[PDB]
Curated annotation (Swiss-Prot), chains A, B, C:
Taxonomy of the source species: Viruses, Duplodnaviria, Heunggongvirae, Uroviricota, Caudoviricetes
Species, as recorded: Escherichia phage lambda (Bacteriophage lambda)
Assigned GO CC terms: viral portal complex
Record's protein name: Portal protein B
InterPro entries (alphabetical): Phage_lambda_portal
UniProt keyword list: Capsid protein, DNA-binding, Viral capsid assembly, Viral genome ejection through host cell envelope, Viral genome packaging, Viral long flexible tail ejection system, Viral penetration into host cytoplasm, Viral release from host cell, Virion, Virus entry into host cell
One of the GO biological process terms: symbiont genome ejection through host cell envelope, long flexible tail mechanism
Subunit structure: Homododecamer. Interacts with the terminase complex composed of two small and one large terminase subunits.
Family to which the UniProt record says this protein belongs: Belongs to the siphoviridae portal protein family.
Amino acid sequence: QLRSWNPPSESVDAALLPNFTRGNARADDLVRNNGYAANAIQLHQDHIVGSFFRLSHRPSWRYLGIGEEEARAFSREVEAAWKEFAEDDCCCIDVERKRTFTMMIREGVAMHAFNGELFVQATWDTSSSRLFRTQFRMVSPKRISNPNNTGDSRNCRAGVQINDSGAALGYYVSEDGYPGWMPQKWTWIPRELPGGRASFIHVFEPVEDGQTRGANVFYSVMEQMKMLDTLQNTQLQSAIVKAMYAATIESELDTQSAMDFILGANSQEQRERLTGWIGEIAAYYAAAPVRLGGAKVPHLMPGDSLNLQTAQDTDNGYSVFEQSLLRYIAAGLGVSYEQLSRNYAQMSYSTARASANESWAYFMGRRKFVASRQASQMFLCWLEEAIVRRVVTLPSKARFSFQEARSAWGNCDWIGSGRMAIDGLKEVQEAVMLIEAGLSTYEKECAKRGDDYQEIFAQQVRETMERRAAGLKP
Amino acid sequence: QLRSWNPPSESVDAALLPNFTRGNARADDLVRNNGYAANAIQLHQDHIVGSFFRLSHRPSWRYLGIGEEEARAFSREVEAAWKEFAEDDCCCIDVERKRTFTMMIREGVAMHAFNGELFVQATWDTSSSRLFRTQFRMVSPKRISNPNNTGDSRNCRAGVQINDSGAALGYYVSEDGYPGWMPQKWTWIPRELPGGRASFIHVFEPVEDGQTRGANVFYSVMEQMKMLDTLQNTQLQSAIVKAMYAATIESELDTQSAMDFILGANSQEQRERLTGWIGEIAAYYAAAPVRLGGAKVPHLMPGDSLNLQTAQDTDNGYSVFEQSLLRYIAAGLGVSYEQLSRNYAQMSYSTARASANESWAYFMGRRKFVASRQASQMFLCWLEEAIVRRVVTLPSKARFSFQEARSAWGNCDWIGSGRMAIDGLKEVQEAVMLIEAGLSTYEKECAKRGDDYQEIFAQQVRETMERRAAGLKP
Amino acid sequence: QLRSWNPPSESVDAALLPNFTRGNARADDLVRNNGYAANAIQLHQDHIVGSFFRLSHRPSWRYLGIGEEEARAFSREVEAAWKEFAEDDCCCIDVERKRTFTMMIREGVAMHAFNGELFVQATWDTSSSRLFRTQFRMVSPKRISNPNNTGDSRNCRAGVQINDSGAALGYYVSEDGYPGWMPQKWTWIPRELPGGRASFIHVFEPVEDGQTRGANVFYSVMEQMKMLDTLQNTQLQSAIVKAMYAATIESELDTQSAMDFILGANSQEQRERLTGWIGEIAAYYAAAPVRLGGAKVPHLMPGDSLNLQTAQDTDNGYSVFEQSLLRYIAAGLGVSYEQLSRNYAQMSYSTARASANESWAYFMGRRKFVASRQASQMFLCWLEEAIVRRVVTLPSKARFSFQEARSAWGNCDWIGSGRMAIDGLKEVQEAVMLIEAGLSTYEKECAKRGDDYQEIFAQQVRETMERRAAGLKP
């Protein structure tokens, strides 16, 4: 058997680019139509980012030789500025003016998930109505292609120009083609501005050297969705056919050799026998109406009997079949089976904890490697704009300017939705005993709950002096 | 039985090299298509390294005769340089500039898993835009081959040149072959620089003396995945055929001897008989429409009846068989069955702990012997560059220079994702009891949680004095 | 019954050497291709050795008449040299330069497990680039054979030379034969150097006097693996045949005596009947397309009907039988059932503890008798080299020199991966209550967790004084 399977060895791009468009189209159709795909991308959406995505700017004061309190004040100021800028009601951060930063990150992670990559473009608006003119717009991967759909080359593959080392020098972006009555035009976009500002951002997860376009996960499960749908239809037809009923009022006659003799007689000149017998039968059963139910039983020719028979007649094993499938697809997306299919039968407590822990580990990995990088990119661009306009002031004794040490100034970490608590008491006991036994400190317990210790402490102070001001027990 | 099985004995390379390429190709196919393979590589990814891979420098001050506090200060400085060098947003550590250090480790371990080995190249960039010019590019094993695909030799096997003892003197790396319109060209790369700096790093696990190329893990389970999918399609085919249904209106006639007489008559001159009977039947059943369901019953020849007899008529034993194959796969891949297949039924707490413990024992070994070595190689190269540029200053009373005692200065250990807590309470009790009872030290508890005690203590001090400065109970 | 089986009585060597090569080849094939064999090798690797194999030097100061504090200082110094020598990044301890000490022992133990023995060669390098010129290289057993493949003699057997008492005087090592285009050349290697230094080390477990080559464990269970594989293939075949559908269109005709008359007529001159009937049937069914599904139902000759009668029609008992063979393999392989097969179903708690305990006892036995001996040999060689170069210093008042009392100076014990917890609380309570109740001392609970009380105490001191210096509660 194994001797019949000899797949050739090609580089990842060689095995991806020729069918890249068809794979993306198949993934888009599958997510649009199939319910489980929508569910899975929804879990990805609600878990990688959560309800909100909060910045925390931790500048490297030690590297920059900056007083730690000065760094803290600077981080507080930039955090306030970013907070007021990001959640603006006008959606001015988006060129399209219909999304805010949270669903910015959401769209980014979702489109990376179902397409393998994400592309963002930072534009410099000219309108002075806002203090910040930096806006962001996403580009669907399908809009990135070679101009005029020309064949790819060594340095031009799938619309992205590469150097000798494979680094992306720029991209070819195609305009939208709707309605399909106009040719698409391709525009060249450099990857980054001459001043080092990130004009265009491409984020994806590569698996090997030289890969230029990400591959969506759905590549490993499409056929499984297909056998799932075929199984659903087959189960439907089985239910139909096992509710099928046939009843005929047949007559035997057709006396073998005398049947042949009657055939000869009727063919020669004696169709009158058949016609008269048919008429008599029709008259009798028009007098009869022999109705099995609400309908009348059809009548058959003499010697003609309905013969319907079926295949083997055991149980089809549908339940275990689709259990095994749903498990296969759940492994394909790496999410827990009991949440993708939301089947929770006979599930224990510790076992549910293990499932959630595995999914959560995967999810934290993706959040760290996908959402965090992209968000850091927007934050760096925005903070560069802010320093340009002196909205936030750098420390006077800065060892390096911002341009020289963009990473040092922009060192930031992002906190999404915290860990959802399976039982409540167990996790709070973890938190309290960890904080009292010295193995943990406030920032992380606020971290796996989505909060931060700064505002928590300030709010505890406010609650305290309000309560003592009102005479309540502190 | 055993008399029909006489496999010959050869060296590992002799039994691996001739098929090596195709094996890798086959492995790739799995991780491209089969869901379980992708899932398995994914858990390898999240468990060997996890979300992040922190460094901790532990110089051997005793061997170097250096004051321990001086060693600690030096370690703090080198760590400060290293973290800002590693997670840079620009991805300047990558030659191609799309990957940071953590996903570099992840790609390395994944490539080692699905190919048996991994290759890294350290390049000396000429751009002064960064304080560090040392960059790293990963090389896929498929690009390592004999030049011009020449015949294998003793000292040139699969692209790596060996000495008399077999030590890797250098390698032959092929350029990218995409698109397939140009001849590949091979470059000779020495294993290490003349100054002892590691120019090229090859990391793999050898099972015997003289092995030159690693073997991917899948080599022992491939046909098992093949029988698994074939099981999937055959079960689907069973499902389709179990809903199979045929209904015929069959007329007997054909009275054997009278059938032969009618055959003789029709052959001679009486072909009108069957034509007339067919016409009469068609007329009647066009008056009739006998519709069992949405269709019309096909009509058969006189004496012709469909018999759809089948094979064995029992249950196929699907569930147990697929469970057996999944167990085989998990055993072959070194992971527990219930996490690979995410089948978590009737899963007891203690038994789940035992299985997770087995997988963890697997993962720590593979992390120590694969990721740790490679990361230490990059760290040594970067540290050499940093000392060259005097970014970090060696102790004045150093017993040996950096070149003489590279291992002593660069003695480092890496902490990945900590152990995942199945229950929470129980392991936390373990940690607190071990700390209070004196058989354990803070670093290892922070290690199984993926933290370090230094910044933990610093943050605890900061939290304490902030809370006291704010009137809160410390 | 029993009279049909009368095996002869020959010595172990006489019953092993004639088929030694074929047995080794069969074992290699099993480990390379079968998943369970690779799994079992992997757990042997992890449990016998673990992530790291740490030395502990315990010189017999009482025998040598040395002050105990002097012995402790000497052991500290030799350990200080030893770790920095062992885990060197350059792999300089290995001649072939890819294995450090830990995976050296790992390769040794797996090598012994799957081949019955292991061979190490200690070489004296001439390069001065390293302080220590002692290197080690493994020798595959297949490279140990009689020169020119000559038949074994009274004193020369399987490449080894024995004295009158059977003691191994030396060995015949064959060079590498890959590619198969050169003639193999055998080298004579004395077992030990004239000065008593162990030039060549052969480690294996003998079961009786005169056994010169070890026997792999796999030699007990091959045909069970083969019946297991055949069970998989036959179960797949059963699944295939259980989903097989047969249906056809056929008539009866063949009127016995008239059938013979028609046969005679067709043979003589009346094939026109058959041809005309075939044509008419083909025309009618080309007008018909009576299709079961997407396929055309085939047609048969008159009097011919498909009859696929089959064998027994009950359950095959696949599950219980597979459990039986898997338990057989585990019993023959020395591990328990639920880790080789990762069959953790319905598994209670205490009984799992008992199973793990017995497997752990097996594993401790092999670690003591296999890994420990080889590690002690290599450590003794390195210690001799270090004393030669005065890297360490012997006590001045030493009763005997190093050469006279190699065992006394080199008395050492190795700690591998410690016992791995199942519940957490229980074993920690064990340790604490043993320590406080006076029945245990810190080093051994450090051992079952894979630590040493010395550095544990030092690190606890450091933690305490750091926490006190930081104002934290000690």
